Amino acid sequence: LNIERLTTLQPVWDRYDTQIHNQKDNDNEVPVHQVSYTNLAEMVGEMNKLLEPSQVHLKFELHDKLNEYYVKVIEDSTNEVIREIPPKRWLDFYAAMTEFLGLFVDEKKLEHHHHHH
Numbered sequence: 001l002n003i004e005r006l007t008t009l010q011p012v013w014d015r016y017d018t019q020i021h022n023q024k025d026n027d028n029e030v031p032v033h034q035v036s037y038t039n040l041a042e043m044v045g046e047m048n049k050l051l052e053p054s055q056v057h058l059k060f061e062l063h064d065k066l067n068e069y070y071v072k073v074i075e076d077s078t079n080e081v082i083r084e085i086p087p088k089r090w091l092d093f094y095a096a097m098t099e100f101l102g103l104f105v106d107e108k109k110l111e112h113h114h115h116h117h
Helices: 010-021 036-053 087-104
Strands: 060-067 068-077 078-085
Touching: 010 087, 036 060, 036 068, 036 087, 068 087, 078 087
Parallel strands: none
Antiparallel strands: 060 068, 068 078
């Protein structure tokens, strides 16, 4: 597909809110990792460089609070946080949007190899 004309994350929210709200007990080779502070930057890094060549200019911010450190999604067009994802749900969001974005991007140039299978 073509991501250069992609502006929306509706299909992502569709999936994400289906998942988060209807949580299951099943393994489908879903990325399961202990989300350490280093792990945030890892997924956030590749996440940004996937959306930059599109209209979906989301600016992901890492902000720590009390015991947690979550990634808040700031929409560049409005300069406000439209979505806040805690680290313990970031893995699902990561997959949710990766399936979506990887349908647009050339599933060869992605070279984002998280070796845990």
